[PDB]
């Protein structure tokens, strides 16, 4: 089995206009996976911000795989006050079994400059 991804830091504070970077950490059992970045909407619904690999049928929300293979930067570029909210990552294995596993949720606070 593979463990649900971790998502850090649990609380990330930045000033409006700067970038905010979470790290999603995930070790898969095969080469077939999609890693998704979400923000919680009103009504407890996930809004997909970005994906690795990208959805080919589809820019402030970016995912970068780090060289150790298991760590991924998930970055809000030029964060806004209204980017404040709850974020998480979801890992989807596609082989040998389709499985969806969410991380614990983290908070982003974007402060007034």
């Amino acid at each position, epitope marked *: 089995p593979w463990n649900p991804p971790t998502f850090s830091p649990a609380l990330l504070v930045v000033t409006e206009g700067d970038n905010a970077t979470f790290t999603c950490s995930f070790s898969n059992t*095969s*080469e*077939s996976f*999609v890693l998704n970045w979400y923000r919680m909407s009103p009504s407890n619904q996930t809004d997909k911000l970005a994906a690795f*690999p990208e*959805d*080919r*049928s*589809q820019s402030r929300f970016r995912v970068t795989q780090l060289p150790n293979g298991r760590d991924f930067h998930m970055s809000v570029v030029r964060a806004r006050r209204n980017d404040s909210g709850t974020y998480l990552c979801g890992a*989807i294995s*596609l*082989a*040998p*079994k*389709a499985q969806i596993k969410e991380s614990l949720r983290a908070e982003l606070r974007v402060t007034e400059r």
Partner: antibody, heavy 116, light 108 residues
């Protein structure tokens, strides 16, 4: 634009061999799974094989295990299906496809006919 | 390994009708189910995945529902371009399998 284009299908005798290829464009090829799906004359769709983005993981329909080999050349954006010991019931249109969760992109198919 | 059976194999309807196509799995496939449309001489096109997610660029009259072993494709009101064959597929584990196809034809 994502595009997939098959080649190589034709007539082969039972027990013979054939190599299909699929050329891909419009995406980072090595980041995505690739697959083959076939459709026998008048029948439905049947998944044949999947290969992982990096090529290390391969998966096969039971009826082609030990006869078909899927492979890819990530430097040339090309998918392959090596079909050995072909059988009459391997007669089909063969589609290249690319799974993301489901197969969101497909080629146009290439026709394979296995007959004496 | 896992079998998918669609019902019916052949369905006639009028333009404007609601159409319902079912797909039964021989064991639990969670929500790892997709639906495709295929017309003669053409490759399949993806309509729905994760059993209820409408794919981008697909008309809103297509919807999917279900989880576990029972899945449904609904066309809320049929249009002339919708007469075609529809396939369900699971990707829960290997081997991936398709249903046998449902051919949607013009009633008269």
């Amino acid at each position: 634009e994502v595009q997939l284009l098959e080649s190589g299908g034709g007539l082969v005798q039972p027990g013979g061999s054939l190599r299909l290829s699929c050329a891909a464009s419009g995406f980072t090829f090595s980041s995505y799974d690739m697959s083959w799906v076939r459709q026998a004359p008048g029948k439905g769709l049947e998944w044949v094989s999947t290969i992982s983005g990096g090529g290390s993981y391969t998966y096969y329909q039971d009826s082609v295990k030990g006869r078909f080999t899927i492979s890819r050349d990530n430097s040339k954006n090309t998918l392959y299906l090596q079909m050995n010991s072909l059988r009459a019931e391997d007669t089909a249109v063969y589609y290249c496809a690319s799974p993301y969760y489901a197969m969101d992109y497909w080629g146009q198919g290439t026709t394979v006919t296995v007959s004496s | 390994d896992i079998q998918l059976t669609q019902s019916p194999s052949f369905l006639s309807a009028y333009v404007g009708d609601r159409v319902t196509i079912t797909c039964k799995a021989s064991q639990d496939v969670g929500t790892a189910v997709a639906w495709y449309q295929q017309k003669p001489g053409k490759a399949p096109k993806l309509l729905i995945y994760w059993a209820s997610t409408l794919h981008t660029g697909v008309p809103s009259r297509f919807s999917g529902s279900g989880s576990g072993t029972e899945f449904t494709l609904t066309i809320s009101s049929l249009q002339p371009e919708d007469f075609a064959t529809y396939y369900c597929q699971h990707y829960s584990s290997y081997p991936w399998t398709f249903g046998q196809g449902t051919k949607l034809e013009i009633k008269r």
